[PDB]
Amino acid sequence: NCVAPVAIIGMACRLPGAINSPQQLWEALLRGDDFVTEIPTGRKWGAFLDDPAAFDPEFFGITEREAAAIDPQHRLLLETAWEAVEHSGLNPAGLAGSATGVFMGLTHNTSFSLASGRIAYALGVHGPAITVDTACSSSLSAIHMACRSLHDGESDVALAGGVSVLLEGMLSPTGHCHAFDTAADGFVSAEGCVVLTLKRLDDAVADGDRILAVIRGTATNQDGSADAQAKVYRMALKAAGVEPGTVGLVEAHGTGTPVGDPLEFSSLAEVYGTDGPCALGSIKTNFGHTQSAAGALGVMKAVLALQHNVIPQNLHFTRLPDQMAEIETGLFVPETITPWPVREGQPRRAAVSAYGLSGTNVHAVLEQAPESPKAGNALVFPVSASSADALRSTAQHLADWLLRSGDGNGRGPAIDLGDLAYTLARRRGFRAARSAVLAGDRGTLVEGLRQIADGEAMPQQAVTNDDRGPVWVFSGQGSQWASMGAELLDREPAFAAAIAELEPLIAAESDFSVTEALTASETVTGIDRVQPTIFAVQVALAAAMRSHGVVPGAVIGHSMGEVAASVVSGALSLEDGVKVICRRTRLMTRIAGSGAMAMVELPAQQVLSELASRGVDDVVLSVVASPQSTVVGGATASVRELIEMWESRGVMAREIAVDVASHSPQVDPILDDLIEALADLDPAEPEIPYYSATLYDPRDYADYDAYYWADNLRHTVRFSAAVQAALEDGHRVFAELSPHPLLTHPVEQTARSLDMPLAVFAAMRRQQEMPHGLLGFVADLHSAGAAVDFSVLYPTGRLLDAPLPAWTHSTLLLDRE
């Protein structure tokens, strides 16, 4: 009523016995596992984490030395809190800048809430960052503060939890929390970490999150170990606005102490158990007293108990204490797996409590989450981890998870691969070491994951952080091959649509069918046909990628490639692009067979010097695509003369087979007619960043008019300079849209010369088998870190609890202690 209802959209835990997830916890509670043991010989009873010092510092951008100096408590909160965010189905990168509050509890050794601050900084969120000492308060205090923070609106999302790490009200000499059993030995300390992800219910429902349960209300109180705590329950119930008779479960403090259990059982009897049997449980029978994590851990049990119909049994119980036995309470301790009491069409409700030594008593009232009621095509399954080793473990764990279900006597129904892909692609964060399996069924997906796990498939190290689209590289002539467009025309509707639109346009200009050329049993050959056909594929590829949610962050053209680059960037209409490429080639026909071109293995500046010192002016620099390779062009006799001069000197120089010696003086006699033919162009500003290989400065303003295309044909192809500029502006993923990669190596050579990292890919290659169209290409780009709007491929789907990525853990501890 009074306070706003809070939805629990996600939760994570790091607990003894390698229980590192809600599902693992649920199964453990059903088996009735006792995690209390003797003291380990690594550091009389207690439940301990396998390695509380384990941490993945590089993932958070911290050095090993600093991480070693950081409190192990803080490190556990960081990783556990991160898991709680991803378990909510939230890409943690998406939280940046949001009003996300952080409320953590721990034991401290002029107030600096550093532990919560680390989490806030790691997520790049703004909002309250509060820590609390659970010796000066309760372990539910953080969760209480989080709910009121949401209510007051100072937070829109809230991470709430606690952690306990043992560094060595009396104790149980047997070493067990016997609950409210007549045994009543005492309690036992324990380690653990739990974090809840909270959001206002109305926001959760609106944003379409998966609600685990609802916190209707909470309350805190000061006791100057008391019976007057009876009011604390009423305060919470009043804030929650619910009758206690409707509460069929109470995860009590359940310390198992002689003085506190009857005292607690007595105060609970006043409020709960009036009508119907209300279960009374304590997870401390399983995990002992996890201190600051006990409250959150208790909630996690209640939430899980609310989701399923069953209630997990308490351990170490046989008989109530004779003193508190004769009361007419419906309260009963579960000894086995007990179904949920009420069938009166009321949502299941539970309550949790936790009392501090200082007399701080906190109580919370919960309710179950609101109810909300062809095949064969391949899907992309993004899988990543902070390291190659971690990815192999991750792939293995996901594979086992898939194989665990899909079986009778297991989770009966098969895991929906459509929802899984949706989860991994849209409801998860992406990490450094990446892979992306392509599969249309479970079998091929498992095999794909095995290959990763067994070290057969190698991971891609992302070179950028999914913040920008890739660079489309448009190459020139010479990539064509027989029936190069055939398979994509059948497999990529967007590719076929783009070609279908181009078909009549190119026909009107050049009088031939581009579709026919792309499906012919022989490679396209005619001067009139080759470049327009290549241009068509390039535009079609870009359209197909856009239909998969991949838009370029920039474009770079090479010679004729600049035409498609101009269209894709929006500088020229589709119609004008056709006019340019078609009318160019029609005029270039007039000079076919004149002049020659040759590749020489020298830097452009050296070549330019030798041409000048030798008085050569009928041969010029035609292409500078790499810092160590140059193409010259001009008079046939002069070119072949230079080749021999270089060859005899030990320099590799090889003539290139070309119809037209473009980018040389040989194209002069058609430039005027070209300029006249392109008089009617209507260019616009490019919407995508465009690095020109025509202009003497790749960042300069391009007009894309008649004179620009004249210069594009006549002047040097400065591809290397354009790639350099793109790298300087932060672009890292380069992908060639063409029938076959002609420029991927030149790009690499340019990047290497500048000591610049990058990832280069090819959309198509000669005789490539493409049964899944360009989805493999999409997968590779994402794995490199290129931005991909996965809402296109996966507009809708259900959130699945696929295992969270394995961490890259290294044991970090300060010496001498």
PDB file of N, CA and C in Angstrom, residues 91 257 673:
ATOM      1  N   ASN A  91      22.231  -6.227 -20.590  1.00  0.00           N
ATOM      2  CA  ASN A  91      23.577  -5.926 -21.054  1.00  0.00           C
ATOM      3  C   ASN A  91      24.166  -4.845 -20.148  1.00  0.00           C
ATOM      4  N   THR A 257      19.793 -20.656  18.135  1.00  0.00           N
ATOM      5  CA  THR A 257      20.313 -20.389  19.474  1.00  0.00           C
ATOM      6  C   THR A 257      19.217 -20.607  20.524  1.00  0.00           C
ATOM      7  N   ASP A 673      33.936  13.845 -72.415  1.00  0.00           N
ATOM      8  CA  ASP A 673      32.666  13.182 -72.687  1.00  0.00           C
ATOM      9  C   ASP A 673      32.069  12.603 -71.405  1.00  0.00           C
TER      10      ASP A 673
END
